[PDB]
Structure formats: structure tokens, C-alpha cells
DNA sequence: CACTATTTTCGGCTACTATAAATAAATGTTTTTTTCGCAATAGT
DNA sequence: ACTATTGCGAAAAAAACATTTATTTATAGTAGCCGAAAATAGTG
């Protein structure tokens, strides 16, 4: 999600705006790393590696704890359950498996 | 294409009842029925290796695929035109895909290709002009700096009112386009200054260094630009105030002839000096050379007692012929054993 | 370096609309609010005929290469165009999505 | 005319062709075609 | 494998940095996840089950 | 205007029938400069006529630093006079000229991107690698470069006459779209 | 309101701009004192002993002036001029031995200083041609000042060392 | 209120690719291929 | 263990072939490092 410098929530695409452009509703992966450049060793913050597609109504999405006014501005249904991905357009969900 | 009765040239397909028969328009005879639908290796190994590498930097620079596949043909011909031999592998592909980036007129510069691989800009710039000259690419888009202003704002993380600061920046740049600076100057430089001037008037996000993380140009050569527009015309009008509504051209002063000044029928053929009269001045004696004699070049000669003295220091700075000697002596040893 | 163009409404006998072109609009995008029947192209899509030819680094004869490849509305019943939007994907690449 | 309108900027504008895909007054990049002025006909059953 | 190819060089052994080329492998965790979710078949290695 | 492009460097090579040894021409000279690890030949420099001499261990020799044309043949044969001290034949037969460079002044500021858009099929440039433009002219097979200051260096003449008809060719072609 | 540096509004996160810019001058400050001083499991242990530092993205920033040939030459002194003009007067023009005279100076910029003296003082180089004679006899001290470092007569001593070496081939 | 010290403020300078176009012996490497060695592996 | 059969691995090398060595014009353009000077602010 967020960086450590700005310490903001994030700036993120809306999910309904994402589902009309056939995009993957994702969130970036940030790590901090320490390594040996040379004569001195050096630690760097906020290295981006990739983008994590994250389910709706999770605490990392902007739909978490809305008041049908932000969600009015983000034109999502309040009665939607959530719990599904928006990879490249079509909305998919992982089923609950079982085994022995 | 030709009917059998009326020799009709146009054919219409009927999709109404899904027979999908093809009928000529004039007389109505069917043309067809029952449609039938469809339900070196080392040369290959080196391109499949190279297929990885031009795709490699496209992930880094956020290059969409229609540039990477378009530059693949430029590498395909330059391999065939014997351009790939001798040069380094990473240099011949980094010069390749920039040409496709220029045809798209993208925001990407050239200096970002040298960035990770830790060379100079004109290191891989040297192989670039050898590509366009040898492979005869005549047409090319100009390096338009107006693209760079729009891309700089996103990583500049400025205020939410970012559209007005670009619309003001481009009207500054269009006013500065009619001005007389960027003709031999740098497109990254002058586009690193006009967006610096527009953001100055509304916020203090100007810190002379945060834009250098974007534009990648020295803090002092952009300050030269901040002085350069001030002294031509109508800058003092808008130094302090004066909303961006004027339409003026002013005088024409490229800052090149001022320093030249501050320092200070066609032409007939039989008036310019010739060439073979200068060739025929002194005689062409092949072996003899005693017609250019003088007294200083005759005295241009060694010192006789310093012949041993000059070579003593010359052999005192010898370590090559020391190291060279056993290379010849091991050559004798390696020849026998 | 060739795009795809939306040229439309070829005309005949002092009028724009052919029987296939009463609902195709000025820009080649089907006009919002009117019905369509069998035939009656609603998005006109034109493709370059040099789809895989090698790039000759010149501009000598590029003026007439767009052959038509439209999408015909099939179906047995007349339907209406509700609205149409156009946008960009994650790469710089345009989209056309109409909802009948 | 009454050409392309934006989603939430909702600003009437006439895009010139093959030039941009975004709207003015906002960086939002989804825009709608407005309804024509042309008459249309219906029934009442 | 993208660093030891460089570390076997005499001249490029002092000034070399690693995370200048972190972005070349960055697009192998996005298109791996977005394929596994779009096409619902997860090909693993440690268990080898399909 | 009646301006003439002055000529700055004239280079020339001749053949030599005798093979050179680096010991006997460097260790008893005055401008002794030879680093075998750095450069495989001996240089020497004279204040008059301010030319520079360069040899080859195979025997051959090439001169540069000549301002005038007749002064090149003066300097090249004085370079042969030192080789007469050593027991070498030191002969010169063919005084070939292949490389004559000139500089000029025009003294009115021009645009260059205007002709780079019009005459772009045959001449072009890159701005961020080099400030000037690179001009091609295959009718005498001459290539050269222009600036934004007007002043145009006429580089690389294989023949001294070859540039003169090329010199006044481009200047009326350049003067168009004059600034105002 | 001149465009050069007024402090005038919010300027968010300006300190990382200020911290890196002020630290840049300290970077060249260590490189000045290096010049004047020249005038005069087990692998991880020393990796712990190395300097640990946090990276701020403004510090490592690169421009066109990066990763390129050349550096800033030390400007010449009048003390160097008298040892320059004396060897310039004895020999014709020999870059080789005078590079060793100035120990940390290289072959490249002493060639450029010959080019530097051409336009600057064009009359001193005309006397350099004309000065082909024994000068004011003070160079004999500078003759043996060249000969006091590693005192070994190379006309006679620097022969036997290859005679030692060429004997080794006849053994082997 | 006024000195003293300093942080700018401003060139000043010095370099430095370029460019072609020679000359040329290196002087690099590249691909392409071929050679040659060792370890890889498994059966002595 | 040790010797033999194997595949690759690394390196030659070949042929090419662009990349370096020293010239001279500048011209405008960066870019780095250095004072040169000048105002300004702490503090007497
Ligand atoms: Zn808008």
C-alpha cells in the first residue's frame, strides 16, 4: 500500500473506473532493502516490485468503511457483498476448496 | 469475382436466413453455396536470445508492447545488414528501440537507457548515429519538448490543481517556442525550465533540485535559463505580475551573435586561388631534398654527450621492454615444449 | 506505426445514409438513442491492409490502404443503442464499448 | 454537435480527432458520447 | 543470475549497483498472479500438482 | 558578400622505401616522444612552420598541422632532412592530398529546424547529442556541418577546388526563410 | 518578484531537497583534501565494519556530466613554472620525462598545458624555440635532482639485469 | 546601532564531446563456430 | 575408490569490424570546480 515517506493512505484507481478499462485492480508491493554498494553498505526504502490484485471490502481498498457518500461518489452499490477480484475487466472470485 | 450469366463484378452475401450464400446483384444467380468455414537455427537462436533482451528493458521503462514488437524489425534488418558485428550486445539493442520510441513521439529521453548500465550518454549515443547513417533512415520525428512537460507532472507529486499549472506551462512554452533559445540547445533543458517557471508562481515546489531528479540536468545550467529569458524582451513586464494574456513576438535575439558582436552575380571561377600552382612552386625532386635547406633544422640534432644521458632516463622509465623481453623468451620455451 | 480509423457514412445520391448507415453517426460511432436492425453497421472499423509488412523507412505511397472490416448487428429483433463510451487501456491503446 | 462529455467532470467538449483520449479540466480518461438531437419514434404499448 | 553475470567482470566490480536492474524481473510477479487468477489453473513446482 | 573561407589544416602522406627502426631515430633526436605501450610511432613538433610529424614503424609517414598548401610541401621535406642524418634512403615520391578543412563566417543568425523539416530527407541532426546540424551534399560528395551562428565549417575536402563550387552553392540555399 | 529563489509557499517535503543539496558540498569537500594530501562469514565481518548509510533518492542523482572521460586538473603554480620552463628550454619538447617530474600529474593534461601556453603567452613559446643553448647554469642542480631518486647509473647497471634473464633461457 | 563574518551571488575558467577525414597498428570486443578440458555421472 | 564414457563449458579464433592512437578549425552548449565579490545577518 502506502509509502513510508508521505505516510498518506494512498492514491488509487476507483474499482468501477477500473472495471470499465479492462485493468487489474491492484496495489503496489513495497519493501526496504539493505545491501553493499561498494566501499560502504547502504540501506534503501520503498522499493517497488509489483502490483497485488486485492479483493473488495478488504481493509486495503478504498471501499472499506464507506458511508454511501464516498461510495456515492465512487458509484458502487452499498448492497454489494464484496470478496472478488477485477483482473483485467471481468470480475472473478476464488472458490472455497476442501480435501481429505 | 465474375458472374456466369451477367458477368457481375459485385457480390452480396445474404445473412437474413443464415444461408450465407453469395449472389450477384444484377440478375440474382447464386455464385457459391454451402460455405466452408475454418473452425539458420543459430540465426534463430541468437534472435530468440535477443527477443528476451529488448523485452527486458521494456519492462523497466514501462514500454507498451507495440513499441517493442515494432523495434524488433529494426533489429531484424540491422542483423541482416551486418551492423550487429563488432559492437556490444546491449549497445546494439538500446540504440535500436529508441528509434521506435522516436517514431511514436514518446516522453522517453535517451539518457535513461544509459542509466542502469553505468555508461555515459554519448557512449551509446556514438552507436546511434552510426545506425541511422548506415541504414539510411531519412524520415525522423523532431525531438519535440512539448511532450516532456505533460509527463513531468505525474512524478512531480504536486498539488491536485495540476492541470492549470500545465496549461500555464504550455502557454509559457508556446510563447517561448516563438522565442529564440532552443535551436541548438537541449529539449530536456528548456522543457526543464519552463515547467520550473510555471510552478514557481503558484507554489514553492521549486527547490532547484526536485526537478533535477526529474529533468536530469545540472542545477546551474537551468539557472542560466532563468537569466536568459530575462534580458531579451517583456520578461520584466511579467517578472512580478501581468497575467498570461499577452500576444507579442518582440525582437529576434538568439544568444549567439551577441557574444560574436561583443567580441568585436555569383562568384566567378577564375578569381579564387588554385591548387596546382601551389603544387608546382618547388621542384618534385624524388630523392634529392637539398632545396629546402636552412640553419635551424640543420642544428635540430642530438646533444652528443647527452646521447647516453637522455637514454639513461629513457631506460630508467623502461618497464615495458623489461616485461616485453620474457614474452619473446617464453615464446622460445613454448615452441620447444 | 499504423492505427485503425473510424471513417464512416459513405454517401449516395445527395444523401449520407445508406440502408446500412442510418444509425452510424458522424464520427463512425453509432449514434446514441436510435434503433438498429439487421444489417445497419453500428461501429465502422477500418483496418490497414499491410498488417504484417516490414517497415520500409520511408513515406512514398501511404494514402489508400484501409480496407473495411465492420461489425454487423445480427439478431431477429430491433434493439436500441443505450450509450457508448470510449477510453484507454493500461497501455496507450483505445477502446470502443457500446452497450445495446 | 454536442460532442464527447466526461464521466464525472461532466464538461461538454468537442475533441478534435486522433489527438487525445483524456478530457480537459480533469485527468480522468473515461468519456461518454452525448445523446443526439435527432428525432426518434416509438409506440405506446 | 542477473548479478553474477556482471560480477564476473574486472572493470565492473566496484561501482556496480544491484537494484538498478531490479525492474527487469519486476514484471514476473504481476503477469504470474494475473494469469493464475484469470485462467484458474495454478502450476506449482514444490508440489507438482495441476 | 565577398568573404573567403580560410583553410586551416592540410594533411598528406608519402611512401618510404626504407623500413623504420624506433631506436635509431628517437634516442638521438630532439623532440623524442615514443611510448610503445601507448602509441606505436614517434611524433616530433617544430615551431616553424608549426606543423607536426608522424611516422610509422612499417616505414610510412603522414604530416598534419599545415596551414597553407605550398607550406605543407616545405614542412614535409624538412622532415626528410633529419632522416638523412640516419643511414636511411629517406625518399618521397607521391605527395597526395586528401583532407582539406575550411571555416567560414556568414554573420546573420539562422534557424536550422526549418530546413531540417524541409530538407529532412537528405540532411538531419540530433539536438541533445550535438548543437549543430550535419549537412550532406553528394553532388561533389561533400559532407559538412552548420550552426545557429551562421558560421559554417567546410570540412574534409579531398580536392582544394572541389569545395569552391560547393561553397557558393549552399549560401543562397541557406539564406531563405530569413528571420525578421 | 525575481524568479531566482524567494521562499514563498507550502513547499512540501523540502527538507530532503535541502538535506541532499547541503550534503553535496560535503562530498567535494573530502575530494579537495585528498588532492592536497597527495601534494604533501569472515567477509561479512568487514562488511559490518564498513559505513552504514541510508539512501535518499536525491543524493545519487545523475546528469549528462556522469560516467565520462576526464576530471578537474589541478591549476598550475609558479613553483611548477620554473621547473617547467627549464626542462622546456633544455630539451625540444618531451612530455615523457616531465610527466615523472610532476609525480601525480599525467601525460594528458601536460599536453593540454602546452596547448594552454600557445594562445595565452605566445611570445614565451617563440623564445622556447630560440632558446637552444646552455641556459643560466642552475639546471645542474636540477640535473642531479632527477638523479637522486634511485641512484643507479642505468648506462651500465641497467644491462646486467637482462643478461641475468637471457642466461635463464640457456639454462631452461 | 554598527562591526565582522559569512552565505550567497556571479561570473570565471577549464574542460569537453562533437564533426569529418584522413592516415594506420593495434585494439578492442562481437557472433559464429569450433576446439578442448573437465567434471558429471555412473559403472567400474 | 577410481577410471572411463559424456556432455557441455569455456575459450580460441576467425572473420569481420567498429573502437582507439595524434591534428585543426571553432561554436554553441554543459558541466564541473573556483574563486570574486557583495550583501546580509549575527552579534558586539
Ligand atoms: Zn474532465
From Swiss-Prot, chain B:
SMART domains attached to this UniProt entry: CYCLIN
Claim: NAD is one of the keywords in the record: no
Cited PROSITE patterns: TFIIB (PS00782), ZF_TFIIB (PS51134)
SUPFAM superfamilies documented for this protein: Cyclin-like, Zinc beta-ribbon
Residue intervals of every TFIIB-type zinc finger in the record: 1-32
Segments crossing the lipid bilayer: none
GO BP terms in the entry: DNA-templated transcription initiation; DNA-templated transcription open complex formation; regulation of transcription by RNA polymerase III; RNA polymerase III preinitiation complex assembly; transcription by RNA polymerase III
Record Pfam families: BRF1, TFIIB, Zn_Ribbon_TF
Gene3D superfamilies: 2.20.25.10, Cyclin-like, Single helix bin
Subcellular location: Nucleus
Any one GO molecular-function label of the UniProt entry: DNA binding
One GO cellular component term noted in the UniProt record for this chain: transcription preinitiation complex
Primary subcellular site in the record, as a coarse category: nucleus
Metal-binding as UniProt keyword: yes
Positions annotated as Sequence repeat: 57-133, 152-231
Residues bound to Zn(2+): 3, 6, 24, 27
This protein's UniProt keywords: Activator, Metal-binding, Nucleus, Phosphoprotein, Repeat, Transcription, Transcription regulation, Zinc, Zinc-finger
Family statement drawn from the similarity comment of this UniProt entry: Belongs to the TFIIB family.
Additional comment: Present with 4330 molecules/cell in log phase SD medium.
Subunit structure: TFIIIB comprises the TATA-binding protein (TBP), the B-related factor (BRF) and the B' component (TFC5).
Function: General activator of RNA polymerase III transcription. Interacts with TBP. Binds to Pol III subunit C34 and to the TAU135 component of TFIIIC.
Protein name per Swiss-Prot or TrEMBL: Transcription factor IIIB 70 kDa subunit
Organism: Saccharomyces cerevisiae (strain ATCC 204508 / S288c) (Baker's yeast)
UniProtKB/Swiss-Prot annotation, chain D:
From-to range in the entire protein, with total length: 26 to 70 of 70
Residues reported in the UniProt entry to bind Zn(2+): 6, 9, 23, 26
Localization terms from the record: Nucleus, Nucleolus; Peroxisome
GO biological process, one term: transcription initiation at RNA polymerase III promoter
Naturally occurring in which organism (per UniProt): Saccharomyces cerevisiae (strain ATCC 204508 / S288c) (Baker's yeast)
Subunit details: Component of the RNA polymerase I (Pol I), RNA polymerase II (Pol II) and RNA polymerase III (Pol III) complexes. Component of the RNA polymerase I (Pol I) complex consisting of 14 subunits: RPA135, RPA190, RPC40, RPA14, RPB5, RPO26, RPA43, RPB8, RPA12, RPB10, RPC19, RPC10, RPA49 and RPA34. The complex is composed of a horseshoe-shaped core containing ten subunits (RPA135, RPA190, RPB5, RPO26, RPB8, RPB10, RPC10, RPA12, RPC19 and RPC40) where RPA135 and RPA190 form the DNA-binding cleft.
Protein name as catalogued: DNA-directed RNA polymerases I, II, and III subunit RPABC4
Disulfide bridge partners, by residue number: none
Zinc fingers, C4-type class: 6-26
Coiled coil start-end: none
Entry keywords, A to Z: DNA-directed RNA polymerase, Metal-binding, Nucleus, Peroxisome, Ribosome biogenesis, Transcription, Zinc, Zinc-finger
Family note: Belongs to the archaeal Rpo12/eukaryotic RPC10 RNA polymerase subunit family.
The keyword rRNA processing is annotated on this UniProt entry: no
Presence of keyword Nucleotidyltransferase: no
Curated annotation (Swiss-Prot), chain E:
Subcellular compartments: Nucleus
Described purpose of this protein according to its UniProt entry: DNA-dependent RNA polymerase catalyzes the transcription of DNA into RNA using the four ribonucleoside triphosphates as substrates. Second largest core component of RNA polymerase III which synthesizes small RNAs, such as 5S rRNA and tRNAs. Proposed to contribute to the polymerase catalytic activity and forms the polymerase active center together with the largest subunit. Pol III is composed of mobile elements and RPC2 is part of the core element with the central large cleft and probably a clamp element that moves to open and close the cleft.
Note: Present with 1950 molecules/cell in log phase SD medium.
Complex formation: Component of the RNA polymerase III (Pol III) complex consisting of 17 subunits.
Family: Belongs to the RNA polymerase beta chain family.
Name of the protein this chain belongs to: DNA-directed RNA polymerase III subunit RPC2
The organism of origin for this protein: Saccharomyces cerevisiae (strain ATCC 204508 / S288c) (Baker's yeast)
Residues of the full protein shown: 401 to 450 of 1149
Swiss-Prot record, chain F:
Sequence repeat start and end residues: 7-83, 97-174
Record's subcellular location: Nucleus
Disulfide topology: none
Keyword match DNA-binding: yes
Superkingdom of origin: Eukaryota
GO MF annotation list: chromatin binding; disordered domain specific binding; DNA binding, bending; DNA-binding transcription factor binding; RNA polymerase I general transcription initiation factor binding; RNA polymerase II core promoter sequence-specific DNA binding; RNA polymerase II general transcription initiation factor activity; RNA polymerase II-specific DNA-binding transcription factor binding
Assigned keywords, A-Z: DNA-binding, Nucleus, Repeat, Transcription
GO CC terms, sorted: nucleoplasm; nucleus; protein-containing complex; transcription factor TFIIA complex; transcription factor TFIID complex; transcription factor TFIIIB complex; transcription regulator complex
GO biological process: DNA-templated transcription initiation; negative regulation of DNA-templated transcription; nucleolar large rRNA transcription by RNA polymerase I; positive regulation of transcription by RNA polymerase II; regulation of transcription by RNA polymerase III; RNA polymerase I preinitiation complex assembly; RNA polymerase II preinitiation complex assembly; RNA polymerase III preinitiation complex assembly
Family membership: Belongs to the TBP family.
Protein name according to UniProt: TATA-box-binding protein
Gene source species: Saccharomyces cerevisiae (strain ATCC 204508 / S288c) (Baker's yeast)
Covered residues, full protein: 61 to 240 of 240
